[PDB]
Amino acid sequence: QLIAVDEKLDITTLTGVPEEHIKTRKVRIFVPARNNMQSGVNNTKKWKMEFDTRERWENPLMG
Amino acid sequence: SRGEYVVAKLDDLVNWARRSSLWPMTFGLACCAVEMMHMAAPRYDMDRFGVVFRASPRQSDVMIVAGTLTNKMAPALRKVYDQMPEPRYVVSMGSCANGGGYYHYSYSVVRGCDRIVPVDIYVPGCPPTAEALLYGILQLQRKIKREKRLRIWYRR
Amino acid sequence: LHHALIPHGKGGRSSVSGIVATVFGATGFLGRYVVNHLGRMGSQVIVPYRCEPYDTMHLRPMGDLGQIIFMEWNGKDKDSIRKVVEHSNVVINLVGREWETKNFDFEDVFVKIPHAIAQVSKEAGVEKLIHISHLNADIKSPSRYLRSKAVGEKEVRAAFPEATIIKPSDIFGREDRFLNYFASMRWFGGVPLISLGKETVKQPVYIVDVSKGIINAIKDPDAKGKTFAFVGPNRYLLFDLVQYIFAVAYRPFLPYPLPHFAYRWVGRLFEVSPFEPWTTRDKVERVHMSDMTLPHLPGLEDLGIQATPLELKAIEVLRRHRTVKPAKTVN
Amino acid sequence: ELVQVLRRGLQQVSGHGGLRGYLRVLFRANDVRVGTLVGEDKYGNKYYEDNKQFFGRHRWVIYTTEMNGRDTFWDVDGSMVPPEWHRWLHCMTDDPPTTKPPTARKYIWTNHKFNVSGTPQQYVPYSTTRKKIQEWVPPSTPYK
Amino acid sequence: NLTLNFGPGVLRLVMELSGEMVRKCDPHIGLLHRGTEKLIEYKTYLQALPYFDRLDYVSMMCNEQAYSLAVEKLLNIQPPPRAQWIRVLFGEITRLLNHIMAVTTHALDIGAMTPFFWMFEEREKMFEFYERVSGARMHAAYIRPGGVHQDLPLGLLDDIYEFSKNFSFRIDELEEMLTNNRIWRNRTVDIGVVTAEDALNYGFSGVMLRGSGIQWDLRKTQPYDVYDQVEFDVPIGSRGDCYDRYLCRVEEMRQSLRIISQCLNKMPPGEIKVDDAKVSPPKRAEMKTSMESLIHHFKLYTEGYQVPPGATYTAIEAPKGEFGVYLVSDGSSRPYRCKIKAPGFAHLAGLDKMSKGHMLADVVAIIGTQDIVFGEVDR
Amino acid sequence: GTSVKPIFSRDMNEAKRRVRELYRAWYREVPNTVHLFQLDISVKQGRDKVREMFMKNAHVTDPRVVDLLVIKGKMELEETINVWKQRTHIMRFFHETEAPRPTDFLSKFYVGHDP
Amino acid sequence: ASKVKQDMPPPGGYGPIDYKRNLPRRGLS
Amino acid sequence: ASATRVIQLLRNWASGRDLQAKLQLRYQEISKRTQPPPKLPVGPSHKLSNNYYCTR
Amino acid sequence: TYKFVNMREPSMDMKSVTDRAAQTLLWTELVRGLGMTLSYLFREPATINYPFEKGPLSPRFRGEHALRRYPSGEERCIACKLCEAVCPAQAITIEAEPRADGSRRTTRYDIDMTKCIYCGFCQEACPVDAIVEGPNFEFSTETHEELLYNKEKLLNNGDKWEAEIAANIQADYLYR
Amino acid sequence: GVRTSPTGEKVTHTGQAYDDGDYRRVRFSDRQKEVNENFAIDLIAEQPVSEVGSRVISCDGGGGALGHPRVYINLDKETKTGTCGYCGLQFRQPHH
Amino acid sequence: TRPTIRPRNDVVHKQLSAFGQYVAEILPKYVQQVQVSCFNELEIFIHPDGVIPVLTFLRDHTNAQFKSLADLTAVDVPTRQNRFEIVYNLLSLRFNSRIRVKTYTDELTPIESSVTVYKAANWYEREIWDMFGVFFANHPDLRRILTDYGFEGHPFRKDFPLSGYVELRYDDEVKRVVAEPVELAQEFRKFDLNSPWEAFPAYRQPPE
Ligand SMILES: CCCCCCCCCCCCCCCCC[C@@H](O)O[C@H](CO[C@H](O)CCCCCCCCCCCCCCC)COP(=O)(O)OCC[N+](C)(C)C
Ligand SMILES: NC(=O)C1=CN([C@@H]2O[C@H](COP(=O)(O)OP(=O)(O)OC[C@H]3O[C@@H](n4cnc5c(N)ncnc54)[C@H](OP(=O)(O)O)[C@@H]3O)[C@@H](O)[C@H]2O)C=CC1
Ligand code: SF4
Ligand code: SF4
Ligand code: SF4
Ligand SMILES: [Zn+2]
Known part of the structure; x- marks a missing residue:
């Protein structure tokens, strides 16, 4: 009833993500730093995963 | 001259005939269609303007996009638009059809029906009132009155 | 490079390509493809029109919000040309007509208007000008169309010494006047060809190839004062080309040799009509005349484009003309 | 009976200033009803009321034939009504601007404008902010 | 056996027919899937409220109430009594609007178009009530998770009373057009019969249950707000077909008139939102005079109120059936998950079984009797 | 250890058998799809596209992932055969309107900051 | 000073509201 | 309603109901579009004392 | 309590059977429906004469947006960005900086009218009554671009509609 | 207080105007540029300074609840005048 | 508790707790946890193998007979090794009650239909x-x-x-x-x- 197959988990072929958004991205795993404007520490409890910043430009209309 | 004065009269007659009988096929995609149904209701009576109720696509003159256009839905709307006889116009009704509206940042929503078909009139509102849609229809009538096909042909 | 014209984004609909193009004759057959290719990469297109706004409506979805601006103009007025090209860094000339009207002959369309456009663009400080002529343009051609084109090239080069001249050869496509003209002969029964269509050789070129060539000529830095010849990969005798066209359309083929003088008379009759003519004296002479060969001119391959053969797109063009054995080529 | 409605129709004919005015109102508004003149607009629009009609038909406007720059003899639209008569006409209030006028402000438009879409007076969007990054200007004098 | 794809509310329907008989009916949906449930995860609870107006567009007020009840349960607060009475009154008005829409459309598709206009005049009057109370005719956002946004204007109750004392004659005219007409009965009687056991197993709710004789109504069994303080009857069918459901809907409208009368006569005084400035925003004058009111206004309109962590499933007796929300809060001011339960989803999933062995023209009648609004089904 | 519940196949061999069955079905279907949708592609390049889509997932060594991919491919074939897809859906596999993205370092450096 | 004024039903309530079906029989055997 | 007596009788006989008692067109019976100002009382938490938030 | 809608048994006596046969043969209920339609033909229609007559509205009605100012002529908006924060559609874009006299004012205030859902959350979140939803609903357009309002358009709308907007606010503010 | 750019365009109250080489000006040809003619800074600069014999004064913008939040302004500094942070009205004590 | 606070209902709380203990007693093979929320909602956390039995029991037992399936949905929690939680909401008309049944799965493990x-x-x-x-x-x-x-x-x-x-x-x-x-x-x-x-x-x- 069990296979017991030995291999690291990989679901990339099932998530539908385009190829250049898997291998070219660099995620950062970190506990966010406390906002120095305040003393509350409730925003520094969990871990966050975020992606690398890409290009942002100006819309020729409306800027 | 006679030639330039005659083309103007014929253009006026054809424009009056075309704007006095606008037969719309209504794409009732979402809540905006309800307000469209309130403009055919007795209080506003679209039919009294010459605007027939629920025209067939093969004999329709104006397309009214009333509601959100999803990605799954866009090819069929384009196909219906391609099947309309040549003197055709498109009226975009509501924020969803105009620019995506409340679902602008959605994975499954076309951000404005002008990405698929060219649009003649944009009717703002979420939803526009039946009165606002009637105003947009009358604006389309004025825009049709302003156009001049025979003068361009004569001068070309 | 004027920071507002610095390219940004990933070359898509809402990107910025740094190109501000005024496309004269954008409401025609090649104009729609040129505008679509310009707008899909995020350039701003100024479209000067003389017709009815309704006839230009199909160009609206080709660009992002605000990226396509429509402007009224007429070729007899230099001020409209000036106001339409004030802010562009690219000017593309696509104005043409295959017949003469009571208001515009070949001289106005192919000589005076291109010269005015080039002069006004040079005075306005436009960086790049791209003018379209014919492959078979020469001052001694029997047809006034081609002769006018040759004259037009001379005046455009004189007014804009850094202009890029492009010489296509009988563009074929979905809205073309080549395959559709040859396939529109079914109504008249047997096709009429001077000398049974066995004496003229054609080298047709795909519309998308020409449009991409114009785009890449815009992109190419050293294609300033060059002249290009856009031709297809294969040359065909006209007889076998028309036979292939009719075979693809599933239509019966009945070609009969016709006297040149007789053909000219037929062409003249069509011309008198107010509406656009199926054929004209100049048209029958232009399709009877063989395509030139200019090996010294840089080609479409020099712009990084592999020309697509007619066999791949003939079905796309001619499927609507219905209700396998490609033709033999000569090279 | 029949004579009463006949007399009312003839009185409607007579109350518009004769056959010429009757035809004018009939062909301009598709209506021949007569009501008490509530007010007159500075652009020429006239505002009438009749409380005996059902809600929605008890207030109406006869549009002027010449607004800012266009002949509005045939081409009338709802955006030609100024804001005060707009509030009265949509039954947002029971009081016409004649009996109580709106508060006067220096910045309020003295001349109302209609919908100017499809017109050289149309609105064109643009960014209202200034340059964010300033480019370095190279010196004009040669270095060597 | 021929296969037809009746493509583009907006519905794609793939059928296999053996002659005139419908052998298989397969609805393809998603033509109005806008990803509402994913979009809600990027909004505060107040910001997420207006999506429920657009879920089932025909009856906007009821969805607002269901969402507000779920959020109130998660917040451990209760709305003031006047807010509850206003909510129930406008829910019954909403029911009348939905019923008129469902009945007229069903008739119009069936080929009878006269009552559509006759009752859309009344629909326009009820839109006027909506607009006078909220400023919008149909996408109202009036019912909030703390009560209601604004109090009624000083003349609204009288106008609602004037409207409601003339509506029974309109229902009588609709019945004169429909109930005893032999063509209407032939189009509706013995069409789309569903048994009680099948209706329960297929997830049906509302009239789709009560037409088969099931005595169930959430306003009676699991009352919310003040529905336990009003008296009305639950119409029950006997044959489980389209005709009995039409009769039930017509009867329901009359009952709604009864409940509206009771709501009008027993409207209490007091405030309209919970007197808790950490949930409901304060008044404008308080916001412009008091430091705490200004702070709470600022925070409620920028961050929003935090909802304690937990998950609830809240359902109400909607005009189209049981309408529910499974709401999961993680403790912040944005919902972690919002699953919307729509009655029309299960009804359309049962369309295949309901249309077995019928004409092609009976499929239209069955779709009309299921009361299907696409926005709620696709979300 | 590392014992997991199966989906359809116990080891890789059954998974490859399912993959081959799906590949046969797609290969058979390609010409009929070309004719029915009035595609301007050829049967040869359609089968090349099928081969390329299959080869995109050639590195999977997990039978559960393999038969999940087989399930998805069978769903896609079901959509194609029943003509639930339109011409645009079929032609989306070819990306005919996208300008090609150069791969070399210099071109990417010229066009922008994106690696 | 001033008392509360909000939208309330009139004293004594509203008049009765008909809701029963009224489908009279015209009368002919 | 500005309807003649004969037309009222004809429509009453045709429908079988008395139309004049319950008309579907609004008239002067509706409320005025200009209303006096309201006062809108305050809720139970507007007390000055014995109103600590921790108890509510 | 509950009610039966279709639990009546037809009588089987000869008179009732003859009545049903007479209905079947002489088409009585169809004539009743014809009479109902005929009665509806002779009553006054409910149609209004747009654009000369308009549908009723309320002071609370939300129309085209406007930016208001104080009686002195200075704008009310102080760039707090509460309307931008609360906007359920992210239709508001705001940029601000100190003015030449040190005042806290906006340099950019855009509303994408094709993303707006006209919910009115902005006007109730505003602490100074700067952004309002004015009574105008007849502002249809021939292009998508003219529906992307900048600050100049909104200030012009405010100066255009201020009289009616202030009257509506005076009517409705005691409910807010 | 609308001014004119050297090119010919009206300078808005935010001070924006396309430079001479800016292609975006093409959007205004055959059309117009929307500019508000009432400049708030000039309009508020025209209001006279109120003379009050109090050390601290309250301002709500006028109109009661139709104004802005009520704020208190200190007038101890004689070199300058107190300015409302919401409305821009100026207040001053009667020096000499 | 004053008028702004939602009132409690201890009777329903006791009834739901007792029925949760009853269900857990009858099917110890699959029931991992039973909870009642402060607003009187009963949830039963089960092993994925027991989806068909437990549901069947809750549908067919004389004392349960939850004959209506109100909703079935999933929740995505990326931090968990089993990513998805499957939620069944059931309604019993006989006893006028509601129950929630929760299970879990990951990207590759199937769940019985x-x-x-x-x-x-x-x-x-x-x-x-x-x-x-x-x-x-x-x-x-x-x-x-x-x-x-x-x-x-x-x-x-x-x-x-x-x-x-x-x-x-x-x-x-x-x-x-x-x-x-x-x-x-x-x-x-x-x-x-x-x-x-x-x-x-x-x-x-x-704080771990
Ligand atoms: C016997 C031979 C027949 C040959 C074929 C002829 C076919 C029939 C043509 C005759 C029909 C007459 C046309 C009627 C048009 C008059 C309508 C007029 O009132 O419209 C106004 C006039 O506007 C235009 O000027 C009308 C232009 C129509 C043409 C004018 C005369 C041209 C006749 C030339 C006929 C020669 C035929 C030659 C070929 C055989 C504008 O009103 P509009 O804006 O809409 O409505 C606004 C809505 N409001 C009123 C509620 C506010
Ligand atoms: N086979 C081919 O198509 C070939 C074409 N070429 C050249 O390429 C160019 C584009 O060809 P194609 O797209 O087929 O041309 P089209 O005839 O399709 O369109 C030409 C454009 O020029 C405009 N135009 C024509 N005459 C005038 C005038 N007097 N004043 C102002 N504008 C005018 C037209 O506008 P409007 O619609 O308003 O009249 C139209 O948009 C032509 O100049 C042609 O000489 C060269 C070789 C082969
Ligand atoms: S535009 Fe607004 S009212 Fe219309 S369908 Fe979309 S959300 Fe609903
Ligand atoms: S009305 Fe609502 S959607 Fe529109 S701008 Fe204001 S807050 Fe945003
Ligand atoms: S409009 Fe009002 S809410 Fe928006 S930024 Fe300005 S002051 Fe703040
Ligand atoms: Zn102040």
Whole structure:
């Protein structure tokens, strides 16, 4: 009833993500730093995963 | 001259005939269609303007996009638009059809029906009132009155 | 490079390509493809029109919000040309007509208007000008169309010494006047060809190839004062080309040799009509005349484009003309 | 009976200033009803009321034939009504601007404008902010 | 056996027919899937409220109430009594609007178009009530998770009373057009019969249950707000077909008139939102005079109120059936998950079984009797 | 250890058998799809596209992932055969309107900051 | 000073509201 | 309603109901579009004392 | 309590059977429906004469947006960005900086009218009554671009509609 | 207080105007540029300074609840005048 | 508690607790946990193997007979080794009660389809498969129900981007609707709203 197959988990072929958004991205795993404007520490409890910043430009209309 | 004065009269007659009988096929995609149904209701009576109720696509003159256009839905709307006889116009009704509206940042929503078909009139509102849609229809009538096909042909 | 014209984004609909193009004759057959290719990469297109706004409506979805601006103009007025090209860094000339009207002959369309456009663009400080002529343009051609084109090239080069001249050869496509003209002969029964269509050789070129060539000529830095010849990969005798066209359309083929003088008379009759003519004296002479060969001119391959053969797109063009054995080529 | 409605129709004919005015109102508004003149607009629009009609038909406007720059003899639209008569006409209030006028402000438009879409007076969007990054200007004098 | 794809509310329907008989009916949906449930995860609870107006567009007020009840349960607060009475009154008005829409459309598709206009005049009057109370005719956002946004204007109750004392004659005219007409009965009687056991197993709710004789109504069994303080009857069918459901809907409208009368006569005084400035925003004058009111206004309109962590499933007796929300809060001011339960989803999933062995023209009648609004089904 | 519940196949061999069955079905279907949708592609390049889509997932060594991919491919074939897809859906596999993205370092450096 | 004024039903309530079906029989055997 | 007596009788006989008692067109019976100002009382938490938030 | 809608048994006596046969043969209920339609033909229609007559509205009605100012002529908006924060559609874009006299004012205030859902959350979140939803609903357009309002358009709308907007606010503010 | 750019365009109250080489000006040809003619800074600069014999004064913008939040302004500094942070009205004590 | 606070109901709380203990006693093979919320809602956390038995019991037992399936959905929690939690909401008309049944699964482990217990599940599981990628074994016909044909991915997953990866337009050169990588003229504005200074001390977690 069990296979017991030995291999690291990989679901990339099932998530539908385009190829250049898997291998070219660099995620950062970190506990966010406390906002120095305040003393509350409730925003520094969990871990966050975020992606690398890409290009942002100006819309020729409306800027 | 006679030639330039005659083309103007014929253009006026054809424009009056075309704007006095606008037969719309209504794409009732979402809540905006309800307000469209309130403009055919007795209080506003679209039919009294010459605007027939629920025209067939093969004999329709104006397309009214009333509601959100999803990605799954866009090819069929384009196909219906391609099947309309040549003197055709498109009226975009509501924020969803105009620019995506409340679902602008959605994975499954076309951000404005002008990405698929060219649009003649944009009717703002979420939803526009039946009165606002009637105003947009009358604006389309004025825009049709302003156009001049025979003068361009004569001068070309 | 004027920071507002610095390219940004990933070359898509809402990107910025740094190109501000005024496309004269954008409401025609090649104009729609040129505008679509310009707008899909995020350039701003100024479209000067003389017709009815309704006839230009199909160009609206080709660009992002605000990226396509429509402007009224007429070729007899230099001020409209000036106001339409004030802010562009690219000017593309696509104005043409295959017949003469009571208001515009070949001289106005192919000589005076291109010269005015080039002069006004040079005075306005436009960086790049791209003018379209014919492959078979020469001052001694029997047809006034081609002769006018040759004259037009001379005046455009004189007014804009850094202009890029492009010489296509009988563009074929979905809205073309080549395959559709040859396939529109079914109504008249047997096709009429001077000398049974066995004496003229054609080298047709795909519309998308020409449009991409114009785009890449815009992109190419050293294609300033060059002249290009856009031709297809294969040359065909006209007889076998028309036979292939009719075979693809599933239509019966009945070609009969016709006297040149007789053909000219037929062409003249069509011309008198107010509406656009199926054929004209100049048209029958232009399709009877063989395509030139200019090996010294840089080609479409020099712009990084592999020309697509007619066999791949003939079905796309001619499927609507219905209700396998490609033709033999000569090279 | 029949004579009463006949007399009312003839009185409607007579109350518009004769056959010429009757035809004018009939062909301009598709209506021949007569009501008490509530007010007159500075652009020429006239505002009438009749409380005996059902809600929605008890207030109406006869549009002027010449607004800012266009002949509005045939081409009338709802955006030609100024804001005060707009509030009265949509039954947002029971009081016409004649009996109580709106508060006067220096910045309020003295001349109302209609919908100017499809017109050289149309609105064109643009960014209202200034340059964010300033480019370095190279010196004009040669270095060597 | 021929296969037809009746493509583009907006519905794609793939059928296999053996002659005139419908052998298989397969609805393809998603033509109005806008990803509402994913979009809600990027909004505060107040910001997420207006999506429920657009879920089932025909009856906007009821969805607002269901969402507000779920959020109130998660917040451990209760709305003031006047807010509850206003909510129930406008829910019954909403029911009348939905019923008129469902009945007229069903008739119009069936080929009878006269009552559509006759009752859309009344629909326009009820839109006027909506607009006078909220400023919008149909996408109202009036019912909030703390009560209601604004109090009624000083003349609204009288106008609602004037409207409601003339509506029974309109229902009588609709019945004169429909109930005893032999063509209407032939189009509706013995069409789309569903048994009680099948209706329960297929997830049906509302009239789709009560037409088969099931005595169930959430306003009676699991009352919310003040529905336990009003008296009305639950119409029950006997044959489980389209005709009995039409009769039930017509009867329901009359009952709604009864409940509206009771709501009008027993409207209490007091405030309209919970007197808790950490949930409901304060008044404008308080916001412009008091430091705490200004702070709470600022925070409620920028961050929003935090909802304690937990998950609830809240359902109400909607005009189209049981309408529910499974709401999961993680403790912040944005919902972690919002699953919307729509009655029309299960009804359309049962369309295949309901249309077995019928004409092609009976499929239209069955779709009309299921009361299907696409926005709620696709979300 | 590392014992997991199966989906359809116990080891890789059954998974490859399912993959081959799906590949046969797609290969058979390609010409009929070309004719029915009035595609301007050829049967040869359609089968090349099928081969390329299959080869995109050639590195999977997990039978559960393999038969999940087989399930998805069978769903896609079901959509194609029943003509639930339109011409645009079929032609989306070819990306005919996208300008090609150069791969070399210099071109990417010229066009922008994106690696 | 001033008392509360909000939208309330009139004293004594509203008049009765008909809701029963009224489908009279015209009368002919 | 500005309807003649004969037309009222004809429509009453045709429908079988008395139309004049319950008309579907609004008239002067509706409320005025200009209303006096309201006062809108305050809720139970507007007390000055014995109103600590921790108890509510 | 509950009610039966279709639990009546037809009588089987000869008179009732003859009545049903007479209905079947002489088409009585169809004539009743014809009479109902005929009665509806002779009553006054409910149609209004747009654009000369308009549908009723309320002071609370939300129309085209406007930016208001104080009686002195200075704008009310102080760039707090509460309307931008609360906007359920992210239709508001705001940029601000100190003015030449040190005042806290906006340099950019855009509303994408094709993303707006006209919910009115902005006007109730505003602490100074700067952004309002004015009574105008007849502002249809021939292009998508003219529906992307900048600050100049909104200030012009405010100066255009201020009289009616202030009257509506005076009517409705005691409910807010 | 609308001014004119050297090119010919009206300078808005935010001070924006396309430079001479800016292609975006093409959007205004055959059309117009929307500019508000009432400049708030000039309009508020025209209001006279109120003379009050109090050390601290309250301002709500006028109109009661139709104004802005009520704020208190200190007038101890004689070199300058107190300015409302919401409305821009100026207040001053009667020096000499 | 004063008028602004929701009133409690201890009778329903006791009844739901007793019935939860009863259910857990009858099926100890599958029931992992039983909870009653402070607003009187009963949830039963079970092992994935017990989906068919437990549901069947809750549908067919004389004392339970939860004959209605109100809703079936999934929740995505990326931090858990088993990513998805499957939620069944059941209604009993005989006893006027509601129950919730929760189980779990990951990207690759199938869950037994419950169409044999409730017909209403047929579409619900389909929607789950469309939105979360959870496979249901022995489903009569499992396929997408909400997304466009050929859509790649499962949008309701947390890591799926809000605007997706592709967008649609009409191309005149190919004369058809085409799909291209997404490009927004205005990027969605991400708001950081969570404040420090925790709101609810009763839900505080140990500092580990
Ligand atoms: C016997 C031979 C027949 C040959 C074929 C002829 C076919 C029939 C043509 C005759 C029909 C007459 C046309 C009627 C048009 C008059 C309508 C007029 O009132 O419209 C106004 C006039 O506007 C235009 O000027 C009208 C232009 C129509 C043409 C004018 C005369 C041209 C006749 C030339 C006929 C020669 C035929 C030659 C070929 C055989 C504008 O009103 P409009 O804006 O809409 O409505 C606004 C809505 N409001 C009123 C509620 C505010
Ligand atoms: N086979 C081919 O198509 C070939 C074409 N070429 C050249 O390429 C160019 C584009 O060809 P194609 O797209 O087929 O041309 P089209 O005839 O399709 O369109 C030409 C454009 O020029 C405009 N135009 C024509 N005459 C005038 C005038 N007097 N004043 C103002 N504008 C005018 C037209 O506008 P409007 O619609 O308003 O009249 C039209 O948009 C032509 O100049 C042609 O010489 C060269 C070789 C082969
Ligand atoms: S535009 Fe607004 S009212 Fe119309 S369908 Fe979309 S959300 Fe609903
Ligand atoms: S009305 Fe609502 S959607 Fe529109 S700008 Fe204001 S807050 Fe945003
Ligand atoms: S309009 Fe009002 S809410 Fe928006 S930024 Fe200005 S002051 Fe703040
Ligand atoms: Zn102040």
